[PDB]
Write a protein that binds this ligand. Structure first.
Ligand SMILES: Nc1ncnc2c1ncn2[C@@H]1O[C@H](COP(=O)(O)OP(=O)(O)NP(=O)(O)O)[C@@H](O)[C@H]1O
Ligand SMILES: Nc1ncnc2c1ncn2[C@@H]1O[C@H](COP(=O)(O)OP(=O)(O)NP(=O)(O)O)[C@@H](O)[C@H]1O
Lengths: 972, 980
């Protein structure tokens, strides 16, 4: 009913839109958007509307209007998942419009494409990308190609991790476009190419990227570029993105003319491919290299060139895992959209899915497939991204039960990659053993192997109590079958030596007694290690935090160690001293094996990880983080990273005048909202109060009234009538699933940088201005927007202050008056103070975000409400929400779990220590586990709580007040 | 003068060596080339040049039959670590002919040339670019042989990596040349030119236009893509300063964009011109480009009708005129010719008017002028800097004292031509002014500032700098107490002088009451912020007297927040603060969102916090965009702010590392007996019957004019030449440091590195790349098919399979190598079969480095670890070490070398050379490139050195009271004289 009301509102608004002119177009587009993205329809979609929208886009007369509506609907912070799939479905029709002969239509189209790319859940990239590749490949309209190329570029910044994985498919499309006959298209393609390469993220070939792009543009530079790449010594993993950029060059190198080049190409092929840890990775490229290698092997006289070529050929065969007769193995299809789609369709065989929801099922399938390529398999991650789409036609409980199952089956398709080899790596072996390990009749390791390379740094991991320390002690004592003797390979178990020196004994004599060289030789090294004479002569009993560690390592040098064994070395060590340790280990030139609960430490030190898997040791190339990507079970170990518990929200910020938690800090009266154009207001005669003790639950089915109430409450929509009050310093945190899903656009940042990214402008970019496009940042000219005040044309000359205006902010603006408009003598003259005027935030942000920001910062500071984005403050805040300080300031979000990402996003959402927390359907994307922790946190929250839900079970023992909208009205 | 015998002997040796060279075949070519090289680069001739030798070389390069041989000699002579300034200018003079050969029909001659050009580019003093560059640009422009063009383009590329900073300033000259080359009909040349162009863009020191570089280059190739490229050009967020390199790449695009038909493109062009140019800080930078932008903008303004496009065009025009300092009638400001070679050349010639400079020294005077021209462009004005780079060429034909006196006048006159420059502009930056004053400042009747101005922007960060005692603190106090005329009152702009507040709080008062007593809000409100700030409940309740230094600072910033400060004033805020707390302060100042003014002797702290630098200059205040590092670029004089006292110039060398079996400083750690060296091909040994010893107490002076004997003796002493006969005892662990001027000049190729990184670079392979293997090309990094070098052992062809150990051999090292024996070598069955340990053999280091450097470094590294001599390159050790040499630790790990002065680069180079704590320091003619101040400090350092010192010099004055042992070569013989 209140839901059937929504369908009507959309009709009125869409009616006004189709008639819209270039003058009011944006005004109504905005309305359509603010309404459509709200909780307006109960378990269904406004089918007719989308139908008219679709039709409107294909008609010259309404093309501009329809699309401009989409652009607004698809803004960066408010695109509702209930709407998203239907919007992406319009991309094709919109691409055609990007090729229309009419300038306005063509322009709006291009614009809309960028809007969408920046609006969709980055993970749904497999639902959107094919549309763009299909279009640009099949069209003959050059302008259309340029618009699509520009959308590709926007996508690089919008979904970088996601695009990286698509590289092998995207690079050849851009490469072909680089050869278009239209000069404008050649220009555009190269630019998109350069932008796209930003996802390679490989330090080893970075500097040569512009040399590779040029080569794609001109083959004649291949020999030149091959000659230029010979020396690149590869260290970082060779990803699919690396290959898509390298292989084509090399392939042309092999089929070159001169023997020198063929040889060089081979070297580069060999050098680079050996660093391919996964065969699936090199599979799609094998076809472009094998044939050229086989061929040259037969055709070139010189034997040196041959040996090289063979070596490359052999390398390729080994890594590729090619079957006999050079047959490339069958690629896994666990990530193939076609595959994930079958799984979902299958799981959906018995529930009656109407036709209008088919597109949604498709979306879900796409997202699912991408999560598998990204290897995101934890339950919360999937609930975060798919559940919201499913409740579009299913009930939460059913959707969640079906979802959990979909993830379990989709994950099971993930192929079991192989395990490691060391021989061809760089090192003269310190040991190579086959052995078993028993500690008191208990088997720790059985018929396993251990090979350590010289000057290499290792880390040993495994579930607590698996025998990590016993193994190290064993190595330390030479109780591993086949291990070299101390004379062949000196091991030094750092800080684990036992002797009988008096606490009286000096540091010098302490080491002297170890029989490691003359006292002279000892002072020498101790001084070189930073010891002062005073220290060398003092009693060991006085060495502090860092100095015993330093002393030990110094002894290791004098002992001429070959391997340094360390067990929880960072204990009792401060940050400077840990930093010191990290630097030393990375530069002492000796092999070191470490056991440490500090994953940050391990990431900074280890080059390899030896993991306990059963009664077997398994080697992985990379640090702890790289380790975890290749071995999920590790996220359940006892490392600093895996640590996850419950959380607490911070105490709200001080408020003067508020003595009791029952005092109203927000009180609305006779409030009413009505979209310009609708027949009757969406909500009216509204009255309510909020306090630090509030515990409200906005229940009921989605409808025109219920959403609009949420939208006025959260500041999005400015009430059309009535009085609104709130403390000057009252802050409301709005928690939507949007932020949870969209954090995937920042896997490259540390939790702390993410919090800065969302906060430095002074306000939460995630929730503030949800009713505006904001997409404006490169608008040097969009700053010349003309404001109509007192019937005169004006440009903003400056914004000076701020003040509350109902549920938002107004800003004091000085102006420039337009004169002789349209004439050669047109000029904008500065006006006087007297003519300044207050302008609502919504009318400024789109063209003057920067000035608005500088103003918000001032007022923040002037009211003492500003909280500084310092790494210390952010770690403290994140601590409360269950995240560890070291991980918050040094680890990249990419390594976090779905659950941890939940904490981080909540942390972000509550950083300004709000007084009222408004949660938008939290059960719609959080599993029972996450829901639990959230429940307790909300019970203990010292501020007001407003939960928008459908789950009564979730509201019980949590809320006490109830808000319900019936016929555009409601009563507390 | 007085004839110098040993020196005359050198002329004869080079004659015998040249005769062997002109006869050399592709087989033994490299062998003699190396011979010629090692000899010619030594202290072989007294104040002169081997005139006829360079003539023979030039004549041989021009002759088919000897081109290859002669050029190969030039290549070895021009190696990366040993080219001597006594020869450098003569070598460069040969480039023209070498370029011509790069276009020779002969496959071999053409190839050797190409390689030689790369060799010279990588060997010259980067600072002498202006002497080399012209040869290459002129050569590529007038030649019609495409192969020559490809060779020269390769040389340009090499230059970018060899002298990045220097090339950056040459961009506006290089880019047009490369652009033309891209229009060459020959397909291979176009590709090659485009590659060189891509490489050159690397001089653009920012990322502003990274994603558009390939497009800009493609656009130069096909100008019909200009319109679309102007569209793509939404770099709109231009942030870094626009330099000559940036302009050289942008202006040609934008200039064509202005002349394009569509008004949309004329408009877009102007928008970009506007946004980019208002980031130009020196009008002289854009001056040479104005002529390609002013006319189009003027024309478009008169031609376009659309008002918007007109506004945008005009705006760009106003910005261009402002930033370009254009005068009346749009006249381009007079270009300063301070950096023109013609200008510095005129200056030196004038100073040398009463000095008879023979025709054979004319090339040197020109070389000297080129260098001086670059120093000015690079704004390198200190005395030591010039003495490091120019004095060594000058003594080719002048006595040191005369050279130094004229050099010092040359420097002063050249530097005086540097245009003073217009001040900086804050207006178009991002901020609403907090203030804008015109004022004078007096303190006790003493004038600190006379009629100057001060403009501060909200939320911006400034640093105040000025020579010691200029009044920086008084100005801050003045601001804090509103004593700067026209400054806002406290109500309008609340300033807080952090930690400089005075009140009468008891040492008993709790932190909370302390803040409360200042009347800054209720106690509840105060607690909320302190906690938000990081204070615990315990601390808020404890007595203020209990707070550490770190918390008093944090408390002081918290109070400023409660007072709603608009400006934070900080004076020496890092004092009494550990690195953690300083790190925290940095972080807070960068995110508090409040304007802050800082005074700190810590340039590193200034760099992490400051966006602008307000510098005291005379009695005026001058603003500069950027932090301290950027500031010092525009104001070179700033590198001497901590100079006033003579003590800051001193340094100490490290204690030589421990050696077992040496209990007296007289104990010989090096002993050479019956030593003799004779170049294969010379009629007699250069030195013979040589006996000497070195101990930790050595204090030797290798006196006498330059000569064949003196130089060779030194060359054996330092490890370069392996003796032909005689015994050599050395210790398994004895280390020698060879300080040559080369390292001091070539550090100008690493201005981008921090001192710490520079040292890491020099010892990358565990050994000093500057002084090790000076007799080898070693430029083999991309040596993949040269590792397939076939070693003939016991008459059998073999390839090295692996190097396993090291052992001392004479004055160098031999390596324990495992082999791979080849069978059917040339046939299709050729297979290099690995041999057994029993066939391993010991090969001298000289024979492995050029083809197996990596493997050798790995062994040298194991031996260092095993002998417990290895010195890890940890930040702490490097800092600790450089501090001994008189360099601040902060600077060493965080500041770029570009910001150091000539005197500071000297400390750094010395720090690099003594990093491994040698037991003997051998200094090659230190007085030839060090000014009085530097020599003073060095002499004291050498006098105190706990290891041995060997000084090769001509100055008896410098050695008086330093050395007592004397080494004087006479007729190929030398017997130590003196005492200890
Ligand atoms: N049109 C829609 N699009 C997307 N999600 C929706 C839509 N309508 C409801 N939801 C979500 O579906 C979930 C509600 O599931 P549901 O089974 O209806 O709960 P419930 O306890 O049965 N409430 P009820 O339907 O009143 O009995 C919530 O997350 C809603 O936000
Ligand atoms: N051929 C040369 N090329 C470059 N530099 C040289 C050459 N010959 C000498 N020098 C340098 O010229 C400087 C010597 O100048 P000089 O005036 O001879 O010093 P001195 O103390 O007066 N010794 P003396 O010449 O015996 O009176 C030293 O730096 C030499 O290394």
């Amino acid at each position: 009913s209140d839901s059937q009301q929504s369908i009507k509102v959309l009709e009125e608004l869409f009616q006004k839109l189709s008639v819209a002119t270039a003058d009011n177009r944006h005004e109504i587009a905005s309305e359509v958007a603010s309404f459509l993205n709200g909780n307006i329809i109960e378990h269904d979609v406004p089918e007719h509307f989308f139908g008219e929208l679709a039709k409107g886009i294909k008609d010259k007369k309404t093309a501009a209007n329809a699309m401009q509506a989409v652009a607004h609907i698809a803004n960066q912070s408010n695109l509702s998942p209930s709407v998203e799939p239907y919007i992406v479905q319009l991309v094709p029709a919109i691409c055609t419009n990007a090729g229309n002969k009419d300038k306005e239509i063509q322009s709006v189209a291009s614009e809309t494409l960028i809007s969408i790319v920046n609006a969709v859940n980055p993970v749904a990239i497999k639902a959107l990308l094919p549309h763009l590749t299909n279009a640009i490949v099949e069209t003959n309209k050059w302008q259309e190609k340029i618009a699509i190329l520009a959308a590709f570029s926007a996508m690089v910044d919008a979904a970088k991790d996601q695009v990286a994985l698509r590289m092998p498919e995207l690079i050849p499309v851009l490469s072909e476009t680089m050869w278009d006959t239209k000069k404008e298209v050649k220009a555009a393609a190269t630019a998109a190419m350069t932008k796209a390469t930003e996802t390679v993220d490989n330090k080893d070939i970075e500097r040569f990227i512009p040399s590779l792009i040029q080569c794609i543009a001109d083959p004649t530079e291949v020999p030149e570029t091959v000659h230029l790449l010979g020396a690149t010594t590869f260290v970082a993993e060779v990803t699919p993105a690396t290959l898509s950029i390298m292989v084509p060059l090399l392939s042309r190198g092999l089929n070159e003319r001169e023997t020198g080049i063929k040889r060089k190409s081979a070297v580069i092929i060999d050098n680079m491919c050996k660093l391919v840890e996964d065969p699936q990775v090199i599979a799609p490229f094998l076809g472009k290299l094998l044939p050229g290698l086989k061929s040259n092997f037969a055709t070139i006289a010189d034997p040196e060139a041959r040996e090289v070529t063979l070596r490359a050929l052999k390398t390729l065969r080994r890594v590729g895992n090619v079957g006999e007769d050079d047959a490339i193995p069958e690629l896994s299809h666990a990530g193939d959209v076609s595959t994930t789609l079958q799984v979902v369709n299958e799981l959906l065989k018995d529930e009656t899915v109407a036709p209008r929801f088919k597109i949604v099922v498709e979306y879900i399938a796409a997202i699912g497939a991408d999560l598998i390529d990204e290897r995101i398999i934890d339950q919360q991650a999937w609930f975060t991204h798919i559940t919201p789409y499913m409740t579009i036609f299913l009930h939460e409980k059913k959707a969640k039960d079906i979802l959990d199952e979909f993830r379990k089956r989709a994950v099971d398709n993930i192929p079991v990659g192989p395990n490691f080899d060391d021989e061809e790596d760089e090192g003269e072996d310190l040991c190579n053993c086959e052995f078993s390990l028993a500690y008191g009749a208990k088997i720790l390791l059985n018929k396993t192997q251990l090979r350590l390379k010289r000057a290499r740094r290792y880390g040993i991991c495994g579930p607590n109590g698996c025998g990590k320390s016993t193994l190290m002690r064993a190595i330390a004592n030479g109780q591993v079958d086949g291990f070299p003797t101390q004379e062949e390979c000196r091991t030094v178990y750092v800080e684990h030596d036992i002797d009988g020196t008096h606490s009286d004994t000096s540091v010098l004599d302490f080491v002297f007694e170890s029989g490691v060289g003359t006292k002279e030789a000892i002072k020498d090294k101790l001084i070189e290690f930073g010891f002062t004479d005073e220290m060398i002569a003092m009693p060991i009993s006085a060495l502090s935090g860092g100095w015993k560690m330093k002393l030990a390592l110094a002894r290791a040098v004098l002992r001429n160690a070959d391997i340094l064994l360390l067990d929880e070395p960072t204990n009792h060590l401060d940050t400077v001293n840990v930093a010191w340790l990290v630097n030393y280990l990375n530069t002492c030139g000796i092999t070191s094996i470490t056991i440490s609960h500090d994953s940050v430490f391990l990431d900074n030190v280890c080059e390899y990880i030896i993991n306990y898997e059963g009664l077997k040791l398994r080697k992985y190339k990379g640090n702890f983080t790289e380790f975890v990507k290749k071995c999920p079970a590790a996220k359940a170990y006892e490392e600093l990273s895996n640590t996850d518990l419950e959380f607490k929200f911070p105490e709200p910020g001080y408020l003067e005048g508020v003595k009791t938690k029952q005092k109203a800090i927000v009180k609305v009266t006779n409030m009413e909202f009505q979209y310009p154009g609708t027949s009757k207001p969406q909500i009216t005669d509204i009255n309510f109060q909020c306090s630090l003790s509030s515990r409200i639950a906005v229940i009921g089915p989605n409808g025109a009234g219920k959403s609009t109430l949420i939208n006025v409450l959260t500041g999005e929509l400015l009430p059309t009538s009535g009085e609104v009050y709130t403390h000057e310093n009252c802050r409301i945190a709005y928690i939507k699933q949007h932020a949870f899903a969209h954090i995937e656009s920042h896997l490259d940042k540390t939790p702390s940088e993410y919090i800065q990214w969302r906060f430095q402008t002074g306000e939460d970019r995630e929730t503030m201005d949800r009713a505006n496009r904001q997409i404006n940042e490169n608008d040097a000219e969009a700053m010349n927007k003309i404001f109509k005040i007192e019937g005169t044309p004006r440009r903003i000359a400056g914004i000076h202050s701020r003040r509350k205006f109902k549920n938002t902010y107004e800003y004091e603006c000085s102006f420039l008056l337009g004169e002789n408009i349209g004439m050669k003598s047109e000029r904008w003259v500065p006006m006087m103070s007297v003519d300044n005027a207050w302008i609502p935030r919504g009318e400024l942000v789109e063209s003057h975000s920067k000035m608005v920001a500088e103003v918000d910062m001032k007022e923040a500071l002037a009211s003492g409400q500003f909280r500084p984005l310092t790494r210390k403050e952010i770690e403290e805040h994140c601590s409360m929400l269950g995240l560890d300080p070291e991980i918050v300031s040094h680890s990249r979000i990419r390594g976090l779990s779905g659950g941890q990402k939940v904490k981080l996003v909540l942390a972000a959402g509550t950083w300004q220590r709000p007084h009222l927390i408004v949660l938008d359907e939290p059960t719609n994307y959080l599993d029972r586990d996450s829901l639990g922790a959230l429940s307790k946190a909300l019970k203990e929250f010292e501020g007001g709580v407003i939960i928008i839900t459908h789950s009564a079970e979730f509201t019980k023992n949590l809320t006490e007040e109830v808000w319900a909208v019936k016929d555009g009205r409601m009563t507390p």
